[PDB]
Design a protein around this ligand. Structure first.
Ligand SMILES: CC(C)C[C@H](NC(=O)CNC(=O)c1cc(Cl)ccc1Cl)B(O)O
Ligand SMILES: CC(C)C[C@H](NC(=O)CNC(=O)c1cc(Cl)ccc1Cl)B(O)O
Ligand SMILES: CC(C)C[C@H](NC(=O)CNC(=O)c1cc(Cl)ccc1Cl)B(O)O
Ligand SMILES: CC(C)C[C@H](NC(=O)CNC(=O)c1cc(Cl)ccc1Cl)B(O)O
Lengths: 222, 215, 215, 222, 215, 215, 222, 222
């Protein structure tokens, strides 16, 4: 499992793979690991699948409940605090074998400068959170390879297309180096999933663009 | 004697309802339209309960605000319990009726409120909108065309009955409702709609320049 | 009969309010100004609830002191729960209205208090200050210009209405409020302001030589 | 124990064996492991027998109770959520030796296209659920052999008869490779049990058809 | 009717206060002086609450003994909670006012007590002593010069007002208080002082040969 | 009206006290002497509370028996809590006053009892014995010479006042008490003493041939 | 992690580094470890990050709550008692791997002599507190090296500038001797953070002065 | 840590050292270990510092609370009982590593003979107390050496000065034989602390007298 997120001038882009394994046996081929929490926020959780889906559905319900009750949406710090509390509450279950690690991406509409409005937040198993300032982050078992690839490929990002290409390349490198991460499937036609957040909101990326980018990358590497 | 107590409580509730403003809910081709006369921009009488459910109230603000909060809690807990598509307005109306009956029976002072619950169809489907009216004592009724609550409703009801037209447009329905309520500019007006054409959430407010353009 | 009980309780609350002093809250260019006639230097009627929220009360001291403490508790717990910027005065006003309604309904003796909540904008932003008035029975209202509570408010209200000027200065507003209240030196005067120009905390008192200089 | 389920154009078919063992000793020869929960849903549970029967009877009662209370049946997602909650609640008893793993088959009447209305859902020991998209699934100790047989025999399925024959063949292969799975008994006359769900509802398959199919398969293999 | 109940309870409390003895608290250069007319040597009306806080009461002994014990408990728990220097007399007065109001509102029989709390400055500091008076209904007031409670206080109050002198000595203040109370030898007299010049604890009693020497 | 309820309860308690027998407690050189008129040899009115504390009661037997048991429990728990020498009669009197006040205020029927607590000095010490009297409503008083409770006490009080002699002997005090009570052989007499000369426990009864010899 | 605090005639100065590590892997480069609790008090916590932030936010909220409730701020001893209670309450969590150790610096406005109004308080894992009388203190894993450097460099302190230079030098020595402490970064431009408390209150030190001092120290050592 | 107490005709004298250690590392140099509980009683606690300060502050508050409530001070036996209860309540925390052992000195004003009015009470870890009758007692890790020194030096005690000199000599011997006990510091000027209780109350001894006595003892030993 590997989920990447990065910033471009105008917003953020988040991408994730589709492989689910049970030890060394492949169990799932088209799992979706990226969710749209609200109009300007996306979350990606790694670890036990059931805990991840439960956390995602609970977080979405809590945000919607607050928005309906108070008539106004929460600020970014409030959402970070709620997610940190949810993560901290699972420490006892995080031990003994039910662990979930989230990653958050968002667009701040209250920021003075619209260009620097994209935010990426990472979390730890004890509930501590950190706001990234380097422009990219990765979570999962193949996060080190993806981070090392982005460290070299980040100079090419100029807009959304460049960032999406860099994210796909990082996922490809992570799948190349890790056996628990699923690479592109050309026999079946399964590709990673991406979400792009900008001033107009959060939109899912169509699969044709990702397929074209993956084919171009595969041709380049060959 | 129980008779005298019930009569006195009913009279108190009737006076409290009668000394309030008027709220009108209509059904048009696009869904449900709520119109109320409210000068304040911070206190609201029309709200959203769930994806396709809308709530309207007449009476004391602090009395139906608690009911609205309770209804939202019930809907979110049921949606997480089973599914989002297993929540309907009839269950909310029944819960409101039970709560109002219990309050009218046990509490020292009855609530001076009148409630209306509206529901529209899901996206990509054809179905008649449903309107339920709940009174202070717990009685629940189903209204096919329109609901008028609060104040002196007889002239408004007569005007709406004489002027109601099925499958009307948004502007025509808004003008008809405004004329019925008059018998009212940008200020002292609260207008909301349940848009059946919206994908997931149907409730939306019409305020500002758009309201004047449509008026 | 419930009618007689409610009438007697309302009359008791009205007498208790009428036999009290007067508190006046005004809105000027710099924010909100609270003026009260209080000789004691140890017991205060104007207080701060949060960073940009201010509280004023008229009536029995031991009755609204508890309300002030409860409001501070609610604000601090909510600020730690979500964030400091997610706390607004409308929530505090709603909580106060619910508490006052419950006290007036259930408690043996109703509270003889009148409450006012004021809120200003955050630093570096432009927004109209908000003033909410809460009565003993739980009614909540929004006032755009000024609030006058306690004692005989009709002459003070008339004087303020005839003399109110928007976007006034601090000295002019203070003099106008003092003239309206007279119809009062360093002693027997309590003056507080919510400074919208302050970075984080806006509440500050003006007492001593500065008050005489501004008077 | 092996329970198989598969999709055909028009609906679903589920099949199961009849052997019950206590270690290496044979204890039961005609156990029924497939239940009809309601008019359009079937469930098959593997593991401890008592837990399986308790889970089945409880699930049926809960569905009927909701239908009677609300005057309208639950949607498919609601049933999946209820089953997942029931499975998740037994985690503590799943450890230390009381484990039950279910498999769900159903027909969705609210689907726009009646042809693609059959659904197969699998579950894990932690309560996570997955909706199959390949067309077949198997549960139990002999599930791997049955899945590998269906992977090769799925190209022949055209209608209900073809699917039933494929399911019987998969069960036969699973019994051939696993000693905890019961094969056809010709001395006694005991055969696996099957349920077919289509637009008209869920119907139990008569034993004569299954006996004929098993005899044909045995003759073919000989 | 609530009015009749409140009036009857107030009348009962007034009679209970009126049929009691008189206690007088004065402020002099050395601090605060308490003088009461009490023949018994085992039951006391003047006590110490904390390092620089003193308590006086008029009314039924078994009624204010419980209040005194509760005040000591509050002070010791707060002192251990934060610090010894974070305890002031205003908090004790507020707690007493809340307790008395709750008793007067809820209990079947109101308490027939009148309480006075006195506070002096810390060692090595200059500050005016503070005197707070608490009544049966929960009202709290601040007195700058003197407090007279119990019995017919009008002649004593008039004599003290005509004879009060600021920055007086101990002997002169004692003689003035005795003369005011007369309008009284070693027996039937209870005299206590809060010595602001003492390092840590300020409360001390003057009884025996010293009282006669100072009389 | 609270006044009528309090008056009726006080009248009931007064009648209950008035229709009872008389108990007399005197102070002599050897300590404290209790004399009561009681024919029964199984039910006793004079008891011991602690090492140097004695208890006397007048009224209904089953009403003050519970009070006596509670006092013994308090004394033993306090003695084990801190020490045996830290227990005094004033604390017991205060506890009795609080209990009697609570019973008179809250219970449906007030207790018809009159209590007396006596304390003497420790071994090898010189100190005046202390006598405390507690009434039904919770009032507590200190008596220096003698206590007379129950029945018509005016003639007995007058006789004791005219005939009281300080530092009297045991026989003279017993004869004086008997003469005062008459205005009575071995039977229908209960005599107890608190012997200040005893090492640890001071309470002892005088019955049988010794009582006749001393009579 | 290393946090230093020292006294100069007129007030106190506190400084801290910016490195966060997870074992031998570097996780954070610009972490802030020094907080301004109120107008005259600063706190620095070492250990688990999440516990430290939670402790800091809780302490600030408690102080503000008391100030608003009573209308008067707490005395120094009261603040010390509250912090000691907060530390003592975490003993059970301090064991098994959630440990936080604070250090407090402050200016007493009720002191008779304004020159000797700076106070430094240290704490232990059981909740015991000590008031320093030597003029300096350090907390963290590199505290011994910093203390040994200050023991020799304390004779040069005369005013705020001298104290700040000494604090930066002590942090530099601690980073030189310890690998879990972050030194100055000239490639990226990240420097330690400092807070100065005097009779006018507590003020954050601008980064330009610290950069100049660090460059001067580096030039001197070269 | 070593605290000594002894009797002289007229009253009692108690003395204690100032060293605090964390294993073999010196942590504190001027710790005060002797407290004045009330006008006629002094207490000295050895063990964990935080537990000792908590016990002392609690004991003082309890004594003052009783005195204010009842209008009369407790007797000596009552104070002993309260201290024994407080010690007994910490048995569970005394195990596993939070141990505090007190020593009590006092003057009885109710005694018939004013000369023999000084009392010394020792306690054990289970809450048992003993009243000394030999005239001296010591507590701490160096108590054996101090007791053996007093056993030989007790014949010289005649008044308060003699007793104070003997106590200082015993502390010096304990520091000579034990490394966890702090001796006199002449470079810094830190000396043990003493309290003298007599018919006029309990008074702290000024440091000049103790410095003179320590210098005389050091000169004698040289
Ligand atoms: C969203 C999620 C797929 C994340 C990934 N985790 C897993 O796949 C872990 N696997 C299971 O939980 C699991 C799955 C099944 Cl089908 C059966 C049993 C188990 Cl034990 B990842 O690589 O970190
Ligand atoms: C429905 C069920 C038969 C499923 C199958 N499980 C078992 O047979 C396990 N067996 C028992 O539980 C059991 C049966 C008896 Cl008669 C006595 C003791 C035991 Cl321990 B399967 O192969 O997975
Ligand atoms: C303020 C704080 C940074 C202090 C320092 N502590 C740590 O860095 C300990 N590290 C973590 O807690 C931690 C950090 C992350 Cl990103 C992930 C996992 C863990 Cl386990 B210090 O050196 O003492
Ligand atoms: C009054 C007290 C100083 C008595 C003495 N005990 C100790 O010094 C034990 N030490 C600590 O408790 C301690 C001190 C610190 Cl600074 C840090 C950690 C620890 Cl673990 B003694 O010698 O018996």
């Amino acid at each position: 499992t590997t989920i990447v997120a990065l910033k471009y001038p105008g917003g953020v882009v988040m991408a994730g793979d589709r492989r689910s394994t049970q030890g060394n046996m492949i169990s799932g081929r088209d799992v979706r690991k990226v969710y749209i929490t609200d109009d300007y926020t996306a979350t990606g959780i790694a670890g036990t699948a059931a805990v991840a889906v439960e956390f995602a559905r609970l977080y979405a319900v809590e945000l919607e409940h607050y928005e309906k009750l108070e008539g106004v949406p929460l600020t970014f710090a409030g959402k970070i605090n709620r997610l940190a509390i949810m993560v901290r509450g699972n420490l006892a279950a995080a031990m003994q074998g039910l662990l979930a690690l989230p990653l958050l991406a968002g667009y701040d509409i209250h920021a003075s400068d619209p260009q620097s409005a994209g935010r990426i937040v990472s979390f730890d198993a004890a509930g501590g959170w950190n706001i990234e300032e380097e422009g990219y982050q990765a979570v999962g078992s193949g996060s080190l390879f993806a981070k090392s690839s982005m460290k070299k490929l980040y100079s090419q990002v100029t807009d959304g297309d460049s960032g999406l290409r860099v994210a796909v390349e990082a996922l490809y490198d992570a799948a190349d180096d890790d056996s628990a991460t699923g690479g592109p499937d050309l026999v079946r036609g399964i590709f990673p999933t991406a979400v792009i957040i900008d001033a107009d909101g959060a939109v899912d990326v169509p699969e044709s663009r990702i397929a074209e980018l993956a084919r171009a990358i595969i041709e380049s590497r060959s | 004697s129980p008779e005298q107590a019930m009569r006195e409580r009913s009279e108190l509730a009737r006076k409290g309802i009668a000394r309030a403003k008027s709220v009108v809910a209509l059904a048009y081709a696009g869904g449900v339209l709520f119109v109320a006369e409210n000068p304040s921009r911070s206190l609201q009488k029309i709200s959203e309960l769930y994806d396709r459910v809308g709530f309207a109230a007449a009476g004391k603000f602090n009395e139906f605000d608690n009911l609205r909060r309770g209804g939202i809690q019930f809907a979110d807990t049921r949606g997480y319990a089973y599914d989002r598509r297993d929540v309907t307005g009839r269950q909310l109306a029944n819960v409101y009726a039970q709560t109002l009956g219990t309050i009218f029976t046990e509490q020292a002072k009855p609530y001076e409120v009148e409630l209306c619950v509206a529901e529209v169809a899901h996206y990509g489907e054809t179905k008649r909108p449903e309107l339920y009216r709940i009174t202070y004592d717990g009685s629940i009724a189903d209204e096919p065309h329109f609901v008028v609550m609060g104040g002196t409703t007889e002239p408004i009801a007569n005007a709406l009955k004489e002027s109601y037209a099925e499958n009307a447009s948004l502007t025509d329905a808004l003008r008809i409702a405004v004329a019925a309520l008059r018998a009212l500019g940008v200020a002292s007006l609260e207008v909301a709609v349940l848009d059946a054409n919206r994908p997931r959430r149907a409730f939306r407010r019409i305020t500002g320049s758009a309201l004047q353009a449509l008026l």
